[PDB]
């Protein structure tokens, strides 16, 4: 089988684009992340997604955004896409002021906590570090 | 009944434990390649096959360039994490 994608709307595509971080964090500004957010925005528009770009959100603004989206009525949407562009560590995305657990974000959309998305594809696209190792590569 | 963690997919730009690379002018390697592969294949391929081409594009076509030798000539492979129960076609 394959997912039913012929609901009236393809669904939402929330892009969280975090470029500038409070000096509290010691995080470099993320040059080039605007080109990503605009590229993502044009791509999902062509897939017929309702796009909502949000910029420089604190760890708290991200949480509040996600419950509010997960509290929406998705009954007429096929899917849900969430793109996070930020610094991170393993399991963690940074708001402008500090870290958020990724699984806190994605639990709002658990098949039991967001019934209008049950049985429906929930895509989380994460551009963010997951640690500090470097892949040196090997020549083929 | 279905599992409450079913039907998620997590497309990570990089492997667990690793840096993720971004270019100050073009954007992150991952997002450039994701958008390019979606533009070219969303009408033709299942989504995971699209993300596998994203994997190949980031893996083969990018190396880091850095005046800091510690950070120079490094590679990146993204990491597709799927709890999906069916195939995902955007057409």
């Amino acid at each position: 089988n394959s997912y039913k994608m012929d609901y009236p709307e393809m669904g939402l595509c929330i892009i969280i684009n975090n470029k500038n971080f409070h000096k509290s964090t010691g995080m470099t500004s993320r040059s080039g992340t605007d080109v990503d957010a605009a590229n993502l925005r044009e791509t999902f528009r062509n897939l017929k997604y309702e796009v909502r770009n949000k910029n420089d959100l604190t760890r708290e603004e991200i949480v509040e955004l996600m419950r509010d989206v997960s509290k929406e009525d998705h009954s007429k949407r096929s899917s849900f896409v969430c793109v996070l562009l930020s610094h991170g560590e393993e399991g963690i995305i940074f708001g402008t002021n500090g870290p958020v657990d990724l699984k806190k974000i994605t639990n709002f959309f658990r098949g039991d906590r967001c019934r209008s998305l049950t049985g429906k594809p929930k895509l989380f696209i994460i551009q963010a570090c997951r640690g500090t190792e470097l892949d040196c590569g090997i020549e083929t | 009944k279905i599992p409450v963690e079913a039907d998620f997919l997590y497309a990570y730009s990089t492997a667990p434990g690793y840096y993720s690379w971004r270019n100050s002018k073009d954007g992150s390697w991952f997002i450039q390649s994701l958008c390019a592969m979606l533009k070219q294949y969303a009408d033709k391929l299942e989504f995971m096959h699209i993300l596998t081409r994203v994997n190949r594009k980031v893996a083969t076509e990018f190396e880091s360039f850095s005046f800091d030798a510690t950070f120079h000539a490094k590679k990146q492979i993204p990491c597709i994490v799927s709890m999906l129960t069916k195939e995902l076609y955007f057409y």
Binding site: Q127 | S13, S20, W21, R22, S24, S64
Partner: peptide, 5 residues
């Protein structure tokens, strides 16, 4: 220039 996230 290439940078890390």
């Amino acid at each position: 220039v290439d940078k890390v996230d």
